[PDB]
Design a protein around this ligand. Structure first.
Ligand code: HEM
Ligand SMILES: OC(Cn1cncn1)(Cn1cncn1)c1ccc(F)cc1F
Length: 524
C-alpha cells in the first residue's frame, strides 16, 4: 500500500509546521536558497534561453557587482558566454546584448516587442510629474520630442550662444569657486562647479531670464531636492514615506507651479515670443489628434528635459576638464584653434564659429566615447523575441539591456580605447538611409559602435544643444584658464552607482588665469 505513504505526506507536513521557530526560520532561508540554485541548474539545460549568470542570493542576483563595476561585469560575462547573456537584478531578469548587433537588437526593436516607458516610468514620473515622457504612450512621447526639438533649431542656437557665454563669464566673475577679478589661481571640485554652470546656462537659454533669476534665491534648494529624487533607488523604492520623497514631491509641485505661473502670465499678457523653450511649447504643444498639452504637462516636460540634460551635460563637462587637466598639450592645441578661429579673441563667439572648431568638438566627441553618461539602457520585453542567427528566445517579462558605452571602450572598435585621443576623430568631429518616428528624420541603422546619444525611436534630441552648451563653455574655459591636477592626482574612476556615470569625487583641479590682469565686467 502507498495509500499509507500519502498519509505520511500529511503527517510530515504536520510535523513540519510543529518545528521549533529556530528551524522554521532556517528553512525559511534554506528552502528558497536551495530552490534557487536547483532552478538555475535546470535553466541552463534550456537552449532557447541565453546563458544566465550564476548567483547565490535569490531576487538580489548579480546586483552588487553590476551596480559597482558594470563594464567589468560585462567583460567577464562576455569572455565566458559571448555577447548575449542574461543575469538577475533585484527581482528582474536582464538580457544583455553586447556590441553593434546588440545596438540593433535593442535600439531598433519593433515598438510592439519592447517598451521604454514600462522600464522607466517608475524612476522618472515621481520626479518629472504626470502625463509626460514615460507617463504616457509612446506616440505621445514621440510628439513631445517633436515639440522640444522645435525650440532646438540652428536659429535658436545662434541666440543661445551669447546667452550661455554671458552666464559662463558671470560665473567666473561671481562664483566663490573662481572670482577671476580678485583671484588669478585657485582650486575647484569639478563636481561642484559643473552642475552649477550647467544649470545656470541651461536655465538662461531654455527657460529664460525669469527662471534663471530664480536660481539666485532659496528656490535653488528646490532644484537640489528634486535633483536627489533622480536616483537608481527609485527602481526599487520609488515611494516610501521618508523626507527624501517629500522634499522631492514638494519640489516637483513647487517647481512645476513656478513654470505654470510664468506660462499663465505670458499667455494672459500676450507675451509669447520666440525667446525660449517655454515660449516654444506654449505656441506649439498640440498633439496630432487635437488634444493640447495642459500647462501642467508642459511644465512637467520642461522639468524632465532640463533635468535629463542637466545630469548628462554636467557629468560630461566635468570629464572634459578632468581629462584635459593632465593634458597640457591638448589644452595648448585647443587654445591655438581658439586664437585662429576667433582672430586672437577679437571675434565674438557665435554658433557658426563653434562649427569651425573641429578639435574642440572632437574633444567633446572623445570624452563622450570614454564617458558615456548612461552606461546601460533598458527596455521591458512585451512580446517573445527571437534573437537572430541564434536559437535564443527572450520571453516577455524579461528586460533587454543595451550598452553602447561598453563598446566605446573596446579596442576592436576603438584602437587603444582606454587612451584619450581627440585626433582619432580627425575629419570626423560631427556629434545613409533615414526614418522618422514622429520627431524628425534620424538614422535608420543603429549599428555604429559609437552611440553616445543612442538611436531609434528613443534617440536623444538634445545632442546639438549639448554640443552648443559644452562648446561655448569649453571655448571660454580654454581661452580664459589653464588648469592641472594637484600633485599625484589623476583622472578619477567613474561612479557607476549614480544616475549618470559621473566622476568619483572629490575631483579637484587647480586653475590659473592665462591673463592674470584680465577683468570681467558687469555689476555685482
Ligand atoms: C552629453 C549630453 C547627452 C547625452 C550623452 C545624451 C544621451 C541620450 C541617450 C543615450 C538617449 C537614449 C536613451 C534611451 O535610449 O533609453 C537620450 C534620450 C533623450 N534625451 Fe539625451 N543626452 C544628452 C543630453 C540631452 C539634452 C541636453 C536634452 C534636452 C535638452 C536631452 C533630451 C533627451 C530626450 C527628450 C530623449 C528621449 C528619450 C526617449 O525618447 O525615450 N538629452 N539621450
Ligand atoms: O534617458 C534619460 C533617462 N535615463 C535613462 N537611463 C538613465 N536615465 C536620461 N537622459 C538622456 N538624455 C538626457 N537625459 C532621460 C530621457 C529623457 C528625459 F526627458 C529625461 C531623462 F532623464
Amino acid at each position: 500500500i502507498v495509500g499509507e505513504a500519502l498519509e505520511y505526506v500529511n503527517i510530515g507536513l504536520s510535523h513540519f509546521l510543529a518545528l521549533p521557530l529556530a528551524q522554521r526560520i532556517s528553512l525559511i532561508i534554506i528552502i528558497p536558497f536551495i530552490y534557487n540554485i536547483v532552478w538555475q541548474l535546470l535553466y541552463s539545460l534550456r537552449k532557447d534561453r541565453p546563458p544566465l549568470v550564476f548567483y547565490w542570493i535569490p531576487w538580489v542576483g548579480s546586483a552588487v557587482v553590476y551596480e559597482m563595476k558594470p563594464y567589468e561585469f560585462f567583460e567577464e560575462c562576455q569572455k565566458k558566454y559571448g555577447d548575449i547573456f542574461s543575469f538577475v537584478l533585484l527581482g528582474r531578469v536582464m538580457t544583455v546584448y553586447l556590441g553593434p548587433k546588440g545596438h540593433e537588437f535593442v535600439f531598433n526593436a519593433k515598438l510592439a516587442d519592447v517598451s521604454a516607458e514600462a522600464a522607466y516610468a517608475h524612476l522618472t514620473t515621481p520626479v518629472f510629474g504626470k502625463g509626460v515622457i514615460y507617463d504616457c504612450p509612446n506616440s505621445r512621447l514621440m510628439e513631445q520630442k517633436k515639440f522640444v526639438k522645435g525650440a532646438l533649431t540652428k536659429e535658436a542656437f545662434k541666440s543661445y550662444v551669447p546667452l550661455i557665454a554671458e552666464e559662463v563669464y558671470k560665473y567666473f566673475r561671481d562664483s566663490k569657486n573662481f572670482r577671476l577679478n580678485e583671484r588669478t589661481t585657485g582650486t575647484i571640485d569639478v563636481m561642484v562647479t559643473q552642475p552649477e554652470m550647467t544649470i545656470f546656462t541651461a536655465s538662461r537659454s531654455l527657460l529664460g531670464k525669469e527662471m534663471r533669476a530664480k536660481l539666485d534665491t532659496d528656490f535653488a534648494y528646490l532644484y537640489s531636492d528634486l535633483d536627489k529624487g533622480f536616483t537608481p533607488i527609485n527602481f526599487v523604492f520609488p515611494n516610501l514615506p521618508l523626507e527624501h520623497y517629500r522634499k522631492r514631491d514638494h519640489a516637483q509641485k513647487a517647481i512645476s507651479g513656478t513654470y505654470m505661473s510664468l506660462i499663465k502670465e505670458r499667455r494672459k499678457n500676450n507675451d509669447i515670443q520666440d525667446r525660449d523653450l517655454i515660449d516654444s511649447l506654449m505656441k506649439n504643444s498640440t498633439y496630432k489628434d487635437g488634444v493640447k498639452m495642459t500647462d501642467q504637462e508642459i511644465a512637467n516636460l520642461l522639468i524632465g528635459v532640463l533635468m535629463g540634460g542637466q545630469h548628462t551635460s554636467a557629468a560630461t563637462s566635468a570629464w572634459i576638464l578632468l581629462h584635459l587637466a593632465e593634458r597640457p598639450d591638448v589644452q595648448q592645441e585647443l587654445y591655438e584653434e581658439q586664437m585662429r578661429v576667433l582672430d586672437g579673441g577679437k571675434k565674438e563667439l557665435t554658433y557658426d564659429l563653434l562649427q569651425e572648431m573641429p578639435l574642440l568638438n572632437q574633444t567633446i566627441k572623445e570624452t563622450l566615447r570614454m564617458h558615456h553618461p548612461l552606461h546601460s539602457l533598458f527596455r521591458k520585453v512585451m512580446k517573445d523575441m527571437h534573437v537572430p542567427n541564434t536559437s535564443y528566445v527572450i520571453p516577455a517579462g524579461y528586460h533587454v539591456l543595451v550598452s553602447p558605452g561598453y563598446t566605446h571602450l573596446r579596442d576592436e572598435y576603438f584602437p587603444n580605447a582606454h587612451q584619450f585621443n581627440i585626433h582619432r576623430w580627425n575629419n570626423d568631429s560631427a556629434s545613409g538611409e533615414e526614418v522618422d518616428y514622429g520627431f524628425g528624420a534620424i538614422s535608420k541603422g543603429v549599428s555604429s559602435p559609437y552611440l553616445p546619444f543612442g538611436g531609434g525611436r528613443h534617440r536623444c534630441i538634445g545632442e546639438h544643444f549639448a554640443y552648443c552648451q559644452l562648446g561655448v563653455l569649453m571655448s571660454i574655459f580654454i581661452r580664459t584658464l589653464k588648469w592641472h591636477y594637484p600633485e599625484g592626482k589623476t583622472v578619477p574612476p567613474p561612479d557607476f552607482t549614480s544616475m549618470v556615470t559621473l566622476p568619483t569625487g572629490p575631483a579637484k583641479i587647480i586653475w590659473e588665469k592665462r591673463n592674470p590682469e584680465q577683468k570681467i565686467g558687469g555689476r555685482h
